[PDB]
Structures are given as structure tokens and as C-alpha cells.
Amino acid sequence: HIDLSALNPELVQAVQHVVIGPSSLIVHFNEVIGRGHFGCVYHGTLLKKIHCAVKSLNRITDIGEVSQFLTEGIIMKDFSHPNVLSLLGICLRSEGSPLVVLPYMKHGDLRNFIRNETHNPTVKDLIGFGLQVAKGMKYLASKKFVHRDLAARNCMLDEKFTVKVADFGLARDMYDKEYYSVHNKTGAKLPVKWMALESLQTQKFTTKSDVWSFGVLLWELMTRGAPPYPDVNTFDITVYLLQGRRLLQPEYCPDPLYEVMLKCWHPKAEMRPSFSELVSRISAIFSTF
Ligand SMILES: C[C@@H](Oc1cc(-c2cnn(C3CCNCC3)c2)cnc1N)c1c(Cl)ccc(F)c1Cl
């Protein structure tokens, strides 16, 4: 049970650009495809029948939470890139929290996809995916949008095997709680093993800290979904990194790709490549395959 007139009126305007009428949407509450802190994700169809993922915000009880979340996430509607997850719309209803409607990604997240033993993606496949992520990160960077949680678990694969950078905006949530820790300066749950050393030190996230995360993401690809720093405690990641230590070369990571990875983790944020640079670099590496 959530009210409409209780929100900032400018936000209600923005949301109404992308409103879905309950009549247009069927949600299958028996078909859970994800569980987040804010709510579950379900199979749904938007009618002309589009298969979608429906994110419930029903664990957000309070209106001040909903407003803040919608305010921060609504910018998602003004993004359009084939390597960025789009927003189909927000279904507002008279009783219950707003439902966030997204395109259904048939192959789920990149991490579970590449970990599936029947899939056995080749080095070429894996580099391909990585290049697709860099392209969507390039777009977001150009919009001055800082992701804050770039990771393989947060990039989706559609039915055409197009990678969509996700878990941002109205989709934002922790869908794998194993990888978020309160052992950081902010005190709140953060993906510490994906975060730039400076972000751990200063609490600030930037496009250049997203590049650091992209480096970790590439490493996840080449390892086919191994968890980074398995013997480093969340208590220790900052000092591990301060000591100049880094994720080691995956067995089937080509040397130029590891080189790229090391550049992404340069202690000096100004020294790391742009996503523009990363696209060119990985594209050339891709082309050797
Ligand atoms: C909000 C939710 O969105 C989707 C999940 C899924 C999804 C999850 N799993 N699967 C299937 C593939 C593997 N086996 C279970 C079903 C599809 C598809 N499309 C989505 N838009 C989501 C989840 Cl659950 C996890 C990470 C994300 F970045 C996002 Cl954005």
C-alpha cells in the first residue's frame, strides 16, 4: 500500500513517462528468478506478449525509501544502448509497492552462464563478452553515469547472446549476498572485492573505479566465474591492495588481456585506461581470435 501524491511531483512526472497499467502486466509470483534485499524478481509478460523480468520493491515498506530509490533510478529511462539493460516501465498500483519491469534475459547473468559446465565458453567467447561489457560501460561513462557495482553477476545475456550491463538504476540490488560485506568504511554492504583501492579508502566511486571493477570482471570471465581473492578476508582486501598485490593471471588469459587487467588496477586513478581505450584495446585482442 503506497500513495502517489506523497512523492515529489517532478518525480511523479518522470515515472509517468514510463508507467505501465496493471491491465497490461501479468506477474507469475510462483516463478522466482532472483531474490534481492528490496524484493524478488519474477517472470512476467507485458501486453503483443513481451517476456519480462518483474522486480518487486515490496520489501521496501516505507515511502521515503521508495522515493529515494525511484529518484535515483529513474534516469535509467533515458539510457539506450544495446549493451545496457533498458527499462520497459514501472507498474504503479493502488495497493502494493511499484513493480519494476525489465526485458527478460534468457541466459541470466554472465557469471552463472560461464560457470555452467555444459556451456564451456571458449577464450574467444569470453573475450567477446568482455568487449560487449566495455562498450556498454563506454556508453554509461559518456553519460557521466557511475555504476558502482560492475561485476559478472550483474551483466546479463539475452537470447541473441547480447550482454547487457545491469544491476543499476531501478534494477539495483544485491542478488548474490555472498559478495557484499559491511567490512568497509561506509558500514553498509558493499562489493569490496570489486572496489578500487581508493574507493575503499575514500568511500567515493568514480568512472575510474568502474574501470577497476571492469578489470576484476575480465578476470572473472577468463577464470569462467571463479570468485576473486578466495583466501583474502574482507578484513584484509584494502591492505592486500595497498601492498601492491593483484589478482593473478588466469591460465587461459592471453598476456595482452592480463596486461589490460593490470592497467585497470593501477593505484593512481588517472593512470588507468578509459572505457574508450578499453574498447579499442580489447577489440584488437579479440580480432587476433
Ligand atoms: C532484476 C533482475 O533481472 C533479470 C533477471 C533474469 C534472470 C535470472 N535468471 N534467469 C534465468 C537463467 C538461469 N536460470 C534461472 C532463470 C533470468 C533475466 N532478466 C532480468 N532482467 C536481475 C537479477 Cl535477478 C540479477 C542480476 C541482475 F543484474 C538483474 Cl538486472
Short mmCIF file of C-alpha atoms and ligand atoms in Angstrom, two decimals:
data_model
loop_
_atom_site.label_atom_id
_atom_site.label_comp_id
_atom_site.label_asym_id
_atom_site.label_seq_id
_atom_site.Cartn_x
_atom_site.Cartn_y
_atom_site.Cartn_z
CA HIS A 1 0.00 0.00 0.00
CA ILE A 2 1.76 3.12 -1.35
CA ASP A 3 0.44 6.63 -2.18
CA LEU A 4 1.01 8.71 -5.35
CA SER A 5 0.53 12.29 -4.10
CA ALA A 6 3.06 11.73 -1.28
CA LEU A 7 6.06 11.93 -3.65
CA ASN A 8 7.97 14.88 -5.11
CA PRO A 9 5.77 15.99 -8.06
CA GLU A 10 8.69 16.20 -10.53
CA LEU A 11 9.45 12.53 -9.81
CA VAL A 12 5.81 11.56 -10.47
CA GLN A 13 6.17 13.26 -13.86
CA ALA A 14 9.31 11.27 -14.74
CA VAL A 15 7.74 7.97 -13.63
CA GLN A 16 4.58 8.64 -15.67
CA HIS A 17 6.64 8.77 -18.89
CA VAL A 18 7.19 5.05 -18.29
CA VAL A 19 4.03 3.97 -16.42
CA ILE A 20 2.53 0.50 -17.05
CA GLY A 21 -1.13 -0.14 -16.30
CA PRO A 22 -1.79 -3.25 -14.18
CA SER A 23 -4.06 -4.49 -17.00
CA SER A 24 -1.00 -4.55 -19.31
CA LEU A 25 1.00 -6.83 -16.97
CA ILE A 26 0.73 -10.43 -15.75
CA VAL A 27 3.17 -11.38 -12.96
CA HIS A 28 3.89 -15.06 -12.17
CA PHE A 29 4.59 -14.87 -8.44
CA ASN A 30 5.24 -18.60 -8.44
CA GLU A 31 8.15 -18.14 -10.90
CA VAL A 32 11.05 -16.58 -8.97
CA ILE A 33 14.21 -15.77 -10.93
CA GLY A 34 16.01 -13.63 -8.35
CA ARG A 35 15.94 -12.58 -4.71
CA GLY A 36 17.14 -9.15 -3.63
CA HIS A 37 17.14 -7.04 -0.49
CA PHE A 38 14.34 -4.85 -1.91
CA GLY A 39 12.30 -7.77 -3.29
CA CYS A 40 12.02 -10.76 -5.62
CA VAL A 41 12.21 -10.88 -9.40
CA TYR A 42 9.54 -12.81 -11.29
CA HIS A 43 8.71 -13.94 -14.78
CA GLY A 44 6.08 -11.62 -16.22
CA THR A 45 4.50 -10.86 -19.57
CA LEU A 46 3.84 -7.35 -20.85
CA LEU A 47 1.00 -6.98 -23.38
CA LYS A 48 1.91 -8.37 -28.29
CA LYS A 49 3.36 -10.51 -25.47
CA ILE A 50 6.78 -9.35 -24.27
CA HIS A 51 8.55 -11.69 -21.86
CA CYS A 52 9.90 -9.62 -18.99
CA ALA A 53 11.60 -9.68 -15.62
CA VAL A 54 9.48 -8.03 -12.94
CA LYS A 55 11.31 -6.66 -9.92
CA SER A 56 9.13 -6.32 -6.84
CA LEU A 57 10.05 -3.49 -4.46
CA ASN A 58 7.77 -4.93 -1.75
CA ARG A 59 10.47 -5.30 0.92
CA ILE A 60 10.78 -1.52 0.82
CA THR A 61 7.97 -0.79 3.29
CA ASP A 62 8.44 2.94 3.83
CA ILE A 63 7.57 5.68 1.33
CA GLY A 64 10.81 7.64 1.96
CA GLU A 65 12.74 4.59 0.78
CA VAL A 66 10.64 4.18 -2.39
CA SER A 67 11.03 7.88 -3.30
CA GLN A 68 14.81 7.84 -2.84
CA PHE A 69 15.08 4.61 -4.84
CA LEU A 70 12.86 5.83 -7.71
CA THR A 71 14.56 9.26 -7.79
CA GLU A 72 18.00 7.67 -8.13
CA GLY A 73 16.88 5.03 -10.61
CA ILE A 74 14.54 6.88 -12.98
CA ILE A 75 17.43 8.26 -15.13
CA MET A 76 17.53 4.65 -16.44
CA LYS A 77 14.71 5.54 -18.86
CA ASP A 78 16.99 7.97 -20.73
CA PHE A 79 19.60 5.32 -21.47
CA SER A 80 19.60 3.45 -24.77
CA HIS A 81 22.47 1.16 -25.78
CA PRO A 82 22.47 -2.48 -26.96
CA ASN A 83 24.94 -3.34 -24.17
CA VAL A 84 22.92 -1.59 -21.44
CA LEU A 85 19.80 -3.07 -19.83
CA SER A 86 16.80 -0.88 -20.68
CA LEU A 87 13.68 -0.20 -18.63
CA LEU A 88 10.35 -1.39 -20.04
CA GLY A 89 8.41 0.56 -17.38
CA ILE A 90 7.11 0.99 -13.82
CA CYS A 91 3.76 -0.58 -12.96
CA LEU A 92 2.14 1.55 -10.26
CA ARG A 93 -0.86 0.13 -8.46
CA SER A 94 -3.30 1.26 -5.73
CA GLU A 95 -2.13 -1.38 -3.21
CA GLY A 96 1.45 -2.66 -3.13
CA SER A 97 4.89 -1.27 -3.95
CA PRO A 98 5.78 -0.24 -7.52
CA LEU A 99 6.85 -3.05 -9.82
CA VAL A 100 9.93 -2.54 -12.00
CA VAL A 101 9.54 -4.14 -15.43
CA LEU A 102 12.67 -5.07 -17.40
CA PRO A 103 13.40 -7.05 -20.59
CA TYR A 104 13.78 -10.76 -19.83
CA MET A 105 17.34 -12.02 -20.25
CA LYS A 106 17.03 -15.65 -21.33
CA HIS A 107 20.55 -16.68 -20.30
CA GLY A 108 20.53 -14.92 -16.91
CA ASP A 109 23.73 -13.35 -15.57
CA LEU A 110 27.10 -13.70 -17.25
CA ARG A 111 28.60 -15.36 -14.15
CA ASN A 112 26.23 -18.32 -13.94
CA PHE A 113 26.29 -18.59 -17.74
CA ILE A 114 30.08 -19.03 -17.95
CA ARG A 115 30.19 -21.31 -14.86
CA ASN A 116 27.78 -23.76 -16.49
CA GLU A 117 29.90 -26.78 -17.43
CA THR A 118 27.69 -27.67 -20.45
CA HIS A 119 28.34 -24.22 -21.93
CA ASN A 120 32.15 -24.40 -21.90
CA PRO A 121 32.67 -20.93 -23.46
CA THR A 122 35.99 -20.65 -25.34
CA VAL A 123 38.61 -17.95 -24.72
CA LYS A 124 37.23 -16.16 -27.82
CA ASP A 125 33.64 -16.33 -26.50
CA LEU A 126 34.76 -14.96 -23.12
CA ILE A 127 36.78 -12.08 -24.65
CA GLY A 128 33.77 -11.30 -26.84
CA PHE A 129 31.51 -10.91 -23.80
CA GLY A 130 34.15 -8.68 -22.14
CA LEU A 131 34.29 -6.38 -25.17
CA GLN A 132 30.47 -6.07 -25.06
CA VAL A 133 30.66 -5.00 -21.39
CA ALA A 134 33.35 -2.37 -22.19
CA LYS A 135 31.08 -0.94 -24.88
CA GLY A 136 28.13 -0.54 -22.51
CA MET A 137 30.46 0.90 -19.87
CA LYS A 138 31.77 3.32 -22.53
CA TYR A 139 28.19 4.50 -23.13
CA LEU A 140 27.44 4.91 -19.40
CA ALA A 141 30.73 6.76 -18.84
CA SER A 142 29.78 9.14 -21.67
CA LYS A 143 26.51 9.87 -19.86
CA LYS A 144 28.60 10.55 -16.73
CA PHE A 145 26.92 7.58 -15.05
CA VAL A 146 28.94 5.77 -12.37
CA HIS A 147 27.85 2.15 -11.95
CA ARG A 148 29.34 1.29 -8.52
CA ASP A 149 28.70 -2.48 -8.83
CA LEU A 150 30.11 -3.71 -12.14
CA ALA A 151 30.64 -7.48 -11.90
CA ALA A 152 29.88 -10.60 -13.97
CA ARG A 153 26.89 -11.40 -11.70
CA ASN A 154 25.49 -8.04 -12.84
CA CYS A 155 25.82 -8.33 -16.62
CA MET A 156 23.03 -10.22 -18.37
CA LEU A 157 22.91 -12.29 -21.57
CA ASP A 158 19.81 -12.07 -23.77
CA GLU A 159 18.51 -14.69 -26.25
CA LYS A 160 20.73 -13.25 -29.03
CA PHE A 161 23.73 -13.54 -26.64
CA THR A 162 23.98 -9.76 -26.35
CA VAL A 163 25.46 -8.77 -22.98
CA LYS A 164 23.51 -6.15 -21.03
CA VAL A 165 25.23 -4.20 -18.26
CA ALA A 166 22.65 -4.30 -15.47
CA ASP A 167 22.04 -4.01 -11.72
CA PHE A 168 21.87 -0.21 -11.92
CA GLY A 169 19.02 2.27 -11.53
CA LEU A 170 15.62 0.72 -10.78
CA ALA A 171 17.03 -2.79 -11.10
CA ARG A 172 19.73 -2.05 -8.45
CA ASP A 173 20.01 -4.68 -5.67
CA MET A 174 22.24 -7.31 -4.10
CA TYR A 175 21.27 -10.53 -5.88
CA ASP A 176 24.20 -12.53 -4.51
CA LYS A 177 24.64 -11.64 -0.82
CA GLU A 178 27.78 -13.79 -0.62
CA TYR A 179 29.71 -10.95 -2.29
CA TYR A 180 28.73 -7.92 -0.21
CA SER A 181 30.40 -7.03 3.09
CA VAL A 182 29.88 -4.45 5.85
CA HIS A 183 33.68 -4.63 6.48
CA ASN A 184 34.32 -1.21 4.91
CA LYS A 185 34.38 2.49 5.87
CA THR A 186 30.71 3.20 4.97
CA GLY A 187 29.39 0.46 7.27
CA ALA A 188 26.90 -0.72 4.65
CA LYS A 189 27.03 -3.81 2.43
CA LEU A 190 29.48 -3.29 -0.46
CA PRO A 191 31.14 -5.50 -3.10
CA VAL A 192 34.53 -4.86 -1.51
CA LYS A 193 36.47 -7.36 -3.70
CA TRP A 194 35.37 -5.46 -6.84
CA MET A 195 36.10 -1.97 -5.49
CA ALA A 196 39.00 0.31 -6.33
CA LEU A 197 41.57 0.73 -3.54
CA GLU A 198 40.77 4.47 -3.37
CA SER A 199 37.03 3.80 -3.17
CA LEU A 200 37.81 1.62 -0.15
CA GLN A 201 39.92 4.45 1.29
CA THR A 202 37.77 7.49 0.44
CA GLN A 203 34.25 5.98 0.07
CA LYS A 204 33.96 7.76 -3.31
CA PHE A 205 33.03 5.93 -6.52
CA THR A 206 34.03 7.21 -9.97
CA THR A 207 34.11 6.09 -13.61
CA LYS A 208 37.76 5.24 -12.94
CA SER A 209 36.69 2.96 -10.05
CA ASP A 210 34.25 1.29 -12.51
CA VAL A 211 37.30 0.64 -14.73
CA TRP A 212 38.94 -1.10 -11.75
CA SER A 213 35.78 -3.22 -11.40
CA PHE A 214 35.88 -3.92 -15.14
CA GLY A 215 39.39 -5.34 -14.66
CA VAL A 216 38.05 -7.71 -11.99
CA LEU A 217 35.14 -8.59 -14.33
CA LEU A 218 37.57 -9.55 -17.11
CA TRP A 219 39.41 -11.75 -14.61
CA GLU A 220 36.06 -13.44 -13.73
CA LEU A 221 35.49 -14.17 -17.42
CA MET A 222 38.91 -15.77 -18.02
CA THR A 223 38.52 -17.92 -14.92
CA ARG A 224 34.99 -18.90 -16.07
CA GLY A 225 33.44 -17.44 -12.91
CA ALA A 226 35.93 -18.05 -10.11
CA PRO A 227 35.42 -15.85 -7.05
CA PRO A 228 38.20 -13.22 -6.80
CA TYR A 229 40.68 -13.34 -3.87
CA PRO A 230 39.21 -16.51 -2.25
CA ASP A 231 41.87 -16.58 0.51
CA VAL A 232 41.72 -12.83 1.21
CA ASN A 233 39.32 -11.96 4.07
CA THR A 234 37.09 -8.87 3.60
CA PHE A 235 39.02 -7.53 6.62
CA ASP A 236 42.21 -7.64 4.51
CA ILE A 237 41.39 -6.50 0.96
CA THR A 238 42.48 -2.88 1.48
CA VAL A 239 45.94 -3.80 2.85
CA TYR A 240 46.25 -6.63 0.31
CA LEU A 241 45.81 -3.98 -2.40
CA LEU A 242 47.94 -1.34 -0.69
CA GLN A 243 50.78 -3.92 -0.66
CA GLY A 244 50.56 -3.73 -4.48
CA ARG A 245 49.17 -7.26 -4.73
CA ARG A 246 46.76 -8.19 -7.53
CA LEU A 247 44.63 -11.00 -8.97
CA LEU A 248 46.93 -13.44 -10.77
CA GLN A 249 46.86 -14.33 -14.47
CA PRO A 250 44.19 -16.92 -15.27
CA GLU A 251 45.59 -19.99 -17.03
CA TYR A 252 43.87 -19.21 -20.35
CA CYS A 253 44.11 -15.46 -20.20
CA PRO A 254 46.32 -14.27 -23.08
CA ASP A 255 49.18 -12.00 -21.99
CA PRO A 256 47.80 -8.80 -23.63
CA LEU A 257 44.49 -9.28 -21.77
CA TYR A 258 46.20 -9.63 -18.40
CA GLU A 259 48.23 -6.51 -19.30
CA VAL A 260 44.89 -4.72 -19.79
CA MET A 261 43.71 -6.08 -16.40
CA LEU A 262 46.82 -4.75 -14.58
CA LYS A 263 46.26 -1.31 -16.14
CA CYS A 264 42.70 -1.31 -14.76
CA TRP A 265 44.16 -1.74 -11.27
CA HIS A 266 46.87 0.97 -11.29
CA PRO A 267 46.83 2.61 -7.81
CA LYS A 268 46.61 6.04 -9.45
CA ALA A 269 43.06 6.51 -10.79
CA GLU A 270 44.34 8.88 -13.51
CA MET A 271 46.67 6.15 -14.85
CA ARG A 272 44.01 3.54 -15.76
CA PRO A 273 42.51 3.36 -19.29
CA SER A 274 39.18 4.94 -20.24
CA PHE A 275 36.37 2.68 -21.45
CA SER A 276 37.07 4.22 -24.87
CA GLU A 277 40.67 2.96 -24.60
CA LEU A 278 39.44 -0.41 -23.29
CA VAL A 279 37.09 -0.91 -26.24
CA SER A 280 39.91 -0.34 -28.78
CA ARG A 281 42.41 -2.46 -26.86
CA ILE A 282 40.15 -5.49 -26.25
CA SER A 283 38.72 -5.25 -29.77
CA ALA A 284 42.24 -5.66 -31.24
CA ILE A 285 42.87 -8.57 -28.85
CA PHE A 286 39.51 -10.04 -29.89
CA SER A 287 40.44 -9.74 -33.59
CA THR A 288 43.51 -11.98 -33.07
CA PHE A 289 41.00 -14.79 -32.45
C1 LIG B 1 16.45 -7.67 -11.86
C2 LIG B 1 16.98 -8.99 -12.40
O1 LIG B 1 16.68 -9.02 -13.81
C3 LIG B 1 16.67 -10.15 -14.61
C4 LIG B 1 16.95 -11.49 -14.26
C5 LIG B 1 16.87 -12.53 -15.22
C6 LIG B 1 17.18 -13.93 -14.94
C7 LIG B 1 17.80 -14.58 -13.84
N1 LIG B 1 17.91 -15.90 -14.01
N2 LIG B 1 17.36 -16.12 -15.23
C8 LIG B 1 17.28 -17.47 -15.79
C9 LIG B 1 18.58 -18.07 -16.36
C10 LIG B 1 19.33 -19.08 -15.49
N3 LIG B 1 18.41 -19.99 -14.74
C11 LIG B 1 17.29 -19.32 -13.99
C12 LIG B 1 16.46 -18.47 -14.94
C13 LIG B 1 16.93 -14.97 -15.81
C14 LIG B 1 16.52 -12.15 -16.51
N4 LIG B 1 16.24 -10.89 -16.88
C15 LIG B 1 16.32 -9.91 -15.95
N5 LIG B 1 16.04 -8.61 -16.38
C16 LIG B 1 18.48 -9.18 -12.12
C17 LIG B 1 18.97 -10.26 -11.35
CL1 LIG B 1 17.95 -11.46 -10.61
C18 LIG B 1 20.33 -10.45 -11.10
C19 LIG B 1 21.28 -9.58 -11.60
C20 LIG B 1 20.83 -8.52 -12.35
F1 LIG B 1 21.74 -7.68 -12.83
C21 LIG B 1 19.47 -8.30 -12.63
CL2 LIG B 1 19.12 -6.90 -13.59
#
